[PDB]
Symmetry: D3
Subunit: 161 residues, 6 copies
């Protein structure tokens, strides 16, 4: 019983961590696809796929979730939405259910015959607070804040803006 979740994780926030835990209550393993793995250094997508892999890895580990319970797979975007589901399939282990609140992701997997569950704190809010010197830290697990400090994430986002 393997589920699949897709998200840009720009950056990985508390809400996403919560949803991952709830998901792990109903499936044995979870494939966590980091979408738009090719985008970085922009206002909407500040971090590279590798940096996000670290954010997810450190955060899940720090929250006690065993590494054997999930797969972290960066997935580049493609121009043709009609092939994106096949694109994901080709890069991942088999899965039974898909979790997403993204209308496009839901519709594509749904048309493909997959059971789509929408999940029961938004990157936008987080990146906006980093830019306006608001309180972004409280919206993220401490392990993630730590990675962002280590890679100079705020310094990057501010210079880009």
């Amino acid at each position: 019983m393997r589920g699949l979740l897709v998200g840009r994780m720009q950056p990985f926030h508390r809400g996403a961590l919560q949803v991952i835990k709830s998901i792990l209550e109903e499936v044995d393993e979870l494939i966590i696809c980091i979408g738009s793995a090719q985008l970085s250094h922009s206002i909407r997508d500040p971090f590279t796929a590798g940096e996000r892999v670290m954010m997810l890895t450190k955060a899940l580990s720090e929250n006690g979730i065993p590494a054997s319970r999930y797969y972290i797979i960066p997935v580049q975007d493609i121009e043709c939405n009609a092939l994106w589901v096949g694109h994901i399939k080709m890069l991942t282990p088999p899965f039974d259910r898909v979790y997403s609140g993204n209308p496009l992701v839901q519709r594509l997997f749904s048309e493909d015959g997959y059971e789509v569950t929408a999940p029961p704190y938004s990157g936008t809010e987080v990146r906006r607070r980093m830019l306006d010197d608001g309180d972004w830290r409280s919206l993220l697990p401490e392990s993630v804040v730590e990675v962002i400090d280590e890679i100079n994430g705020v310094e990057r986002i501010k210079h880009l803006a």
Copy 2:
């Protein structure tokens, strides 16, 4: 102390498993990049990236190596060799040493300033035995043989040939 190993894993054999174990003796974690993640269904590259993720995952787990000791990241190839190292960096956590016996991989990482260690049983031999009805099973961990049977790998390779 994180190392990086790159290979097509078509399919993941005993020799590669042995090398992974030896590598894990000198580094804390190992990033295992599955190269040519975009190629599948050909004589040289029979399996999709997702199928190889399963082969690696099951095999490492079955050999007792904890999931927290490694990262499995499928990496698509790119046309420009000159950017491939940056391509890998962008998709992965930071690493200190690179392990490879592939001249091209060694040279590219070397020119980039990385310390390249060549590893102390070849996909070609394995795929050739699958095609000629030779003894391919003995060259692979049993968990891998199991995945290949589950996905009808031999049936696929024979029809393609």
Copy 3:
């Protein structure tokens, strides 16, 4: 005497059908290129190229226009506008005149030395009525409405929105 018309046909409406008929009065055959053949499942481009081929095919046939009078060729977009005309040429039979009301299409073919005729009811209006439950059906040939019902087009566009 072969003409060429390019359009996204998202979806194929009454106005476009009318223009096609008028065009067929002055040329023997018409090459109908379905532009942006790679885009689907978005607000501006709901339908795949194949679905649009069906919309065009059924509609022209239903309006009595013989199949031998035209060619339906899906054309993917390319990043470089400067090569798009050559792109179209490479995928199509030879043509003498180009019909379009799209400034970009007119300018590109014009710079290439082609005679461009602007045609003597807009996808946008159609898709907006599908979304707002307005009267979209009356803007389209009945064969097209039929295809949209068969492929659940409205259900798709609403979920995406």
Copy 4:
């Protein structure tokens, strides 16, 4: 009842025409996909997709097959074999059976759940005779020979060689 046939048609020969006729005995319409639509001016792929569309169009028409019985759709190749079937689907009307003698095409459609029928005179032979001044004309329908003369096909292939 719609079938699908895929081929490079470099150039369209007598054997392929024969197979198309036999296929049209068991299905109402046939989607004829011209594969490798992006390749031209090489020894293995001399002609552009548009030139092949003309070869097919003229030949089928000349052999009395009504235009309403088929669809000619040029299809560009893609790097990932795993997505090629979805690629074809996205560009075409729905189909029930697939006809091919190409192992790769058969395997891909088969894995996708499609019924694949292998067809009951080879481009290679044709192009080899064009190059060695052998008898290529007899291997092709006269309408095709005519198109090749009109576009200077032999002159092209010889200069390239």
Copy 5:
């Protein structure tokens, strides 16, 4: 001592010429990269890379700057910002300093370890005056105005708009 400057040059204006001269006071040679070399015929990017090469070439020559003092290299954009610096490196001679006022360009080269100097009259203003019949000519070197007249640049931009 070689510097590097990157810009779209849509079109090459007086301000950019001034900056190039000042730059040539502190470095022996200057690599001038024409960014977005693949974009043309749009409101933001009217001219092809080749047309811009002519604008730069004629203007620098006309202002007395010796050809041996610079390199004009058109550079296509790429999707992954993380590899763009390596992309530039691969296409150019070695350079010691980078000059730019573009935050993204500055940040990318900075993260790569390069010394970035922001330069001590904007394409947007120029293109806006061409469209509104304002005074665009005075914002450009006369050699550039001449190239634009020769290629019918204004006629193009107006038709596109």
Copy 6:
């Protein structure tokens, strides 16, 4: 009166230099396109486009040819031969004649309506001597040998082999 020459220049040899000089006797300026600008670090294409720009630049300068007499423009390859000529046009200043001994290049430009002149010492021979420790230096201008030593070209080619 501007001519155009295309070559991979892997590496730039004496014969190519000779041809460039002869060409400069019949045209005012010469556009020298470095083909396959995206390929590097392989047996057939050892050097990056930037390294080749240096080889050409230094060699022409050293042979007394004024920089104002030519343009060095790296050109990436594209999959569709049918668009390659338009690709070159888009990246370059206008030209009147094309010089090449490459059948494909000759045929493509010829079909496009261009006057193609075949030129009145082969990279292959040069790279083979670098690999077999033969006498490669004598086949190249000294400025080129110098660049190769500076970038460790032989060390690279040998490791790759």
